[PDB]
Design a protein around this ligand. Sequence first.
Ligand SMILES: [Mg+2]
Ligand SMILES: [Mg+2]
Lengths: 449, 449
Amino acid sequence: TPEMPVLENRAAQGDITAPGGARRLTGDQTAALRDSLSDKPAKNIILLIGDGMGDSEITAARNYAEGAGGFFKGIDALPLTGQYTHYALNKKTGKPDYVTDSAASATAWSTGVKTYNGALGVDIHEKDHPTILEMAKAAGLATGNVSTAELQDATPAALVAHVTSRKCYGPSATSEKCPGNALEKGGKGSITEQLLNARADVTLGGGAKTFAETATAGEWQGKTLREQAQARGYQLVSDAASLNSVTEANQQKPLLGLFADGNMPVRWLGPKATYHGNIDKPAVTCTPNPQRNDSVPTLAQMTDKAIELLSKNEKGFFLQVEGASIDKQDHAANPCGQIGETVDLDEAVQRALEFAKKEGNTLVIVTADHAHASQIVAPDTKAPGLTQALNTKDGAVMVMSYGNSEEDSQEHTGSQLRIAAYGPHAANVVGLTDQTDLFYTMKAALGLK
Amino acid sequence: TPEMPVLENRAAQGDITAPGGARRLTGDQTAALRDSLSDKPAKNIILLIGDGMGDSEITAARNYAEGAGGFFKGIDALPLTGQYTHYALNKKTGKPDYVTDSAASATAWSTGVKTYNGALGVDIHEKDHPTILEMAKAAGLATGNVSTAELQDATPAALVAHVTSRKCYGPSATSEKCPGNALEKGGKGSITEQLLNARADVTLGGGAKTFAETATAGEWQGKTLREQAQARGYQLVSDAASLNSVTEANQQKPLLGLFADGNMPVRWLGPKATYHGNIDKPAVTCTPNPQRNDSVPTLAQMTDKAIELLSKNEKGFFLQVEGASIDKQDHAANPCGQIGETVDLDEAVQRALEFAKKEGNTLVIVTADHAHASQIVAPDTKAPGLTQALNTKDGAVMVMSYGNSEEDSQEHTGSQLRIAAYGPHAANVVGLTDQTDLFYTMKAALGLK
Ligand SMILES: [Mg+2]
Ligand SMILES: [Mg+2]
C-alpha cells in the first residue's frame, strides 16, 4: 500500500520554446510535500556522496547527459532539498577555514564535530570521536561502506579510522606521518588496520595496494594486511564474479571487496581541458572507458549488492556509498571524467530509492562533501584557466571552465551546496543546515544514543 | 491561527570546535515543515531577486559579513528551499543556451516562456507574452517594481516592457536597435515608454537619465519622458525626503521614484581583485560608500515604502524587488561590491518576511536570476584569473576568485541555484524546478487567469 512519493518526472514537460513548455511541474506541490513528511523511525539509512558534486557539477552533468531540461531519475528525484555548509577549521586557531578537504568534511557528517583539513575521525585537539557507522554497529545494525575510491581514501576511511592525517593509509605512512597513531607506538593503527578492526559487514571499493603492506606489531605482526583480513575471517572478493557468489555478509563472515589496486575505473574518457580549449580545439564527445566492463562491478551494482546483504539484518542497516572523483594532476580539469562520475552516482541513487520506496522505512540522503571548481560558461568564452567545449544530449555546445588554480591539486571551492533526502526524517535537510547537522540527523533518525 | 514560522536562528548553535557546536538545528524539523505548508490563496506576493546571488555568492557574503557559522536573518530564514534551472535558448535553433543573461531569465519568471539572451517579454519568434505584473494589474491587484538598477535595466524592465533587445532603453536606442518596437515605426515603444504605459502603482529605482529623452510620436511627441510622466499623473520623487512625503500610490497617482541618473550607489567599497591578489596584496576590509547616506533610500527602505503603499489595496499586491549588481566593468570582480549588494538584499528580505509573517497570506520568494562567477578558494591559492584576500567577521582570511573570463563583461555561469520561499504555495519551490515554473507558481498562487 503506497509509500512516500519519489519524484517521477521533473524534466521539462513540453516544448521548451513554447509558453509553459520548459515547466518541470504539472501542478501544485503542497500535497506531494505533505506526503513526503514523516517523523516515524528510519529502520535504514543510505547516504550517497558525490565527490565534488555541488550544484554546478549536477547542472553540467545534467546538461551533458540528459539535456538542460532533462532529469536525473536518481539525483533529481529526491523531494526534500536544502543547502548545507561544510567549512573546516584552522587547527591552531579554531577559526573557520572556508575551503574544506574531503577528510574534514567526511569527519563532520560521520562524527558531528568540525575538524582541520586532513583529519579523519578526530577533532582539532586530535581527540577521537565515534562515527555513525561505529555507533550503528554498536546498536546492532548492519553496516556498509562502499566507494569507487581506494578504501583508504578520506571519504570511506572517515567512517572507520581515527588518524591525525588522511595520508596514513598503511603501516609505513602511519609510522612516518602519524607516529601517535602507529600500532608499534601504542596507537590504534593505520587507516587500513583500523578498517579491519571496525569490521563493517560490507566494505566494497578500490585500494588493494595498501593490503600488501605488513603489520609492524600486534597479533598479525609480519603478515600482510590481506593475510590479516583472511585470518580474521573476512570474505575477500576481487571482481564481479566473486562479488556475485557472496550470499551473506555479517560479523562472522564480513565482506571485503577490493576491486582495483588504487581507485576503480572512471566511467568516461575525454581530454583534459586546455587554455582556450573551447576556441582552439574541437567540441568533445565523451567515450566509454574500456577498463569499465562486466568483470568490475559498477557503483550501482556494489550498492545493490550491499543493500541485498545488509537488508537481511532485522534491526536495520546504515550504508554509505561514495561516487569518488579522480580529479588531480593528469586527471584534473576533466569534464568527461567528472560528468561520468556524476552519472555513476545517479545510477546508485536510483538503486537506493527503488529499495527505499518499497521498504518504506529507509531514509536516503544525497549530497557532496564539497563542490568541484568547474563552471558552466558561455560558448565563446575566453577564460584565463582551462576550458573545453562539449557536445551535449541537446545537440548544442556547452563550455566548462576550470579557473580556480594554476596548479592541478586544488579542485574544490567553499560554496554551500545541495543536500537532498527521501523518507523518514528527511525534513532535516531542508533550508540552511551544516554538514555536522547531517550526523545528528542520521543519529536521531536511527534512534542511536 | 498562529503564523507560519520563519527560521529565527540557524547560526551555528555553539562552539564550532566542539562536538555539536556547529549544528544549525536544535531538533527535528518535521513539525516545523508541516506547519510551513499551505495551499490557501496568496493575497500578496513579494519576489526578491539578487542579481548573481547563487549559492557561492550567498556563502561568500555570509562568510564575510556574518562569519561561516553565521545566519542571514532574511536570506537564510525561508524554510522551504530548492534549486532551479535558468538556461536560455539559442534564438535561431531553439536549443538550450546553457548560460542566460539577466533579460532572458527575467523574461522566464515574468512570462513563463524561455527566450534568447537579451530579449525582454518576447519569445524566440519575437512575439510578446503578458507578464505577471500586467496580469496582476488586470485582476485589480496593486503592483510594485523596485530595483537598485536603472529602471530600464533587464530585471525591472521585463515586468513592463516587450522589446527584442534589452538595449532599447529610450526612443533613440529603440529606433536604432529595435526598429519594429519604435513608437514612430509602429511599435509599442522603448522600455521607458512601455514602463509609463504599464503604470505600476509603485516603481522605485535608478535610471533618471533616459527620462530626459523626448518621444518621437504619439500624444506626447516632443515632450521628455519625464514631462510625459508628469502629464499622465505620476507622482515623481527623486530622494529619500520626497519619497517619505508620499502618502498613497494608486492608478490615479502612480508613484515613480528616480533616485539616480544610472544605477543607485553601491553599499560597500573595495579594490578590484587582481592577478595573484591574495598573495601580492594585503587582505581587504570593505568600507562604506560615502555616496550611500540618508538622502538616498536603501533597498530595504524602498521595499518597506512599497509594502506600506501597496498593502492598502484590499484585493492584494504583487511586488518585485531587485538587489542589482554593478559588476561590469571597471566594476567587475569586486568582492566588496558584490558582498555589500547581497547584504542590501538581506535587509530587504527581512522587511518582506516581517510583513509576511504578520499578514499571513503573503508568499515571499527569494532567488537569483543567475549566479555570479566568484568562487571561494583556499587562502594560498595561485589562480590564473583575479583574486583577493578578505578579512571576515570570523577574524580569518577568505579568498575570492574570478577565473571565468579574461574580459570584464561575462560575470555569470550556468549553475542551477537556490530558490527559497515562505507563505502560501511555497511548496512549489522545493526540489528541482525551472525558472519558468516560478511564473506559474505566482500565477496560480494569486488565482490569476
Ligand atoms: Mg572522497
Ligand atoms: Mg538585473
